[PDB]
Design an enzyme around this catalytic site. Structure first.
Site, PDB file in Angstrom:
ATOM      1  N   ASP A 105      24.142 -85.538  56.644  1.00 51.33           N
ATOM      2  CA  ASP A 105      22.803 -85.897  56.274  1.00 51.33           C
ATOM      3  C   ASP A 105      22.915 -87.511  56.208  1.00 51.33           C
ATOM      4  O   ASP A 105      23.664 -87.823  55.666  1.00 51.33           O
ATOM      5  CB  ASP A 105      22.466 -85.504  55.000  1.00 51.33           C
ATOM      6  CG  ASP A 105      21.080 -85.309  54.720  1.00 51.33           C
ATOM      7  OD1 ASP A 105      20.083 -85.799  55.586  1.00 51.33           O
ATOM      8  OD2 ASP A 105      20.485 -85.309  53.564  1.00 51.33           O
ATOM      9  N   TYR A 137      26.006 -79.398  45.182  1.00 49.09           N
ATOM     10  CA  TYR A 137      25.162 -78.064  45.928  1.00 49.09           C
ATOM     11  C   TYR A 137      25.754 -77.063  45.097  1.00 49.09           C
ATOM     12  O   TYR A 137      25.435 -75.822  45.574  1.00 49.09           O
ATOM     13  CB  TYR A 137      25.194 -78.036  47.407  1.00 49.09           C
ATOM     14  CG  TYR A 137      24.167 -79.166  47.912  1.00 49.09           C
ATOM     15  CD1 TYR A 137      22.929 -78.911  47.660  1.00 49.09           C
ATOM     16  CD2 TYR A 137      24.420 -80.335  48.521  1.00 49.09           C
ATOM     17  CE1 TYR A 137      21.957 -79.806  47.984  1.00 49.09           C
ATOM     18  CE2 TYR A 137      23.594 -81.103  49.140  1.00 49.09           C
ATOM     19  CZ  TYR A 137      22.205 -80.833  48.648  1.00 49.09           C
ATOM     20  OH  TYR A 137      21.421 -81.922  49.027  1.00 49.09           O
TER      21      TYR A 137
END
Length: 115
Positions: A45, A90
């Protein structure tokens, strides 16, 4: 050039300085340019590759815990590496195929703006 270990085992490494005076507080809108990587070098990302920054409200649970904890210790303009352990990122699930379970994430982030 502090290195700081904070809530969650999150590590802040200061790469380049900000104004040293303007820090985001809970609720503040922050505009960030970041790049996210896995421990193995794999990029996952990057707002930089997209040509437009990321905006979010900070300390309200709208981003990983590591950012709610980490972003507010940066001053506007500051560039820093956040090394965020799984539980602050996460989590134990991750996003399978992208982010492994309980993965430590390395973010190079620049705080561009606070409102």
């Amino acid at each position: 050039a502090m290195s700081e270990t904070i809530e969650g085992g999150v590590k802040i490494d200061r790469l380049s300085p900000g104004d040293g005076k303007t820090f985001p507080k809970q609720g503040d809108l922050v505009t960030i340019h970041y790049t996210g990587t896995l421990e193995n070098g794999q990029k996952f990302d990057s707002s930089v590759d997209r040509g437009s920054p990321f905006q979010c409200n900070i300390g309200v649970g709208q981003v990983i815990k590591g950012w709610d904890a980490g972003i507010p210790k940066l001053s506007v303009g500051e560039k820093a590496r956040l090394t965020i352990p799984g539980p602050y990122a996460y989590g134990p699930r991750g996003f399978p195929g992208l982010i492994p379970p309980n993965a430590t994430l390395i973010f190079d982030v620049e705080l561009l703006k606070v409102n």
